[PDB]
Design a protein around this ligand. Structure first.
Ligand SMILES: C=C[C@H]1CN(Cc2ccccn2)C(=O)[C@@H]2CCC[C@H]1N2[S@](=O)c1cc(Cl)cc(Cl)c1
Ligand SMILES: [Cl-]
Ligand SMILES: [Cl-]
Ligand SMILES: [Cl-]
Ligand SMILES: [Cl-]
Ligand SMILES: [Cl-]
Ligand SMILES: [Cl-]
Length: 107
């Protein structure tokens, strides 16, 4: 599944809702901490629509349990990420993923 561990607090009250555009910054790491992607390095907030399944399951469920302004660590099992196959060239087989996510805004 996905485990969400708080890093810095949000408002404790405003959570993503189905159909909202969710705006975050993130860094993605393999289980051992090897960074593979970051919106921060691009200086480009990342947006996805909750419930559209355009991001992995661990994001759908993990970011939805964050409140606006929160920074949190999401630890995502392979079955909530890219599974047995992974995504060749960046996500290896059966990879547990760790994301450092900040929920910036809902629009
Ligand atoms: C590249 C941006 C997305 C990619 N997706 C959705 C996705 C779309 C198409 C193929 C694989 N995954 C995702 O669900 C997750 C979580 C949101 C942030 C990024 N990823 S991962 O960090 C990721 C980052 C990169 Cl550069 C490539 C891939 Cl295959 C996966
Ligand atoms: Cl979107
Ligand atoms: Cl999107
Ligand atoms: Cl969308
Ligand atoms: Cl790979
Ligand atoms: Cl297993
Ligand atoms: Cl595992």
């Amino acid at each position: 599944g996905v485990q969400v561990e708080t890093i810095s607090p949000g408002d404790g009250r405003t959570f993503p809702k189905r159909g909202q555009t969710v705006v975050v910054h993130y860094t993605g790491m393999l289980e051992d901490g090897k960074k593979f992607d970051s919106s921060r390095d691009r200086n480009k907030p990342f947006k996805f629509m909750l419930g559209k399944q355009e991001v992995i399951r661990g994001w759908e469920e993990g970011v939805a349990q964050m409140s606006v302004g929160q920074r949190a660590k999401l630890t995502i099992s392979p079955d909530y990420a890219y599974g047995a196959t992974g995504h060749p060239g960046i996500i290896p087989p059966h990879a547990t993923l760790v994301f450092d996510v900040e929920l910036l805004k809902l629009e």
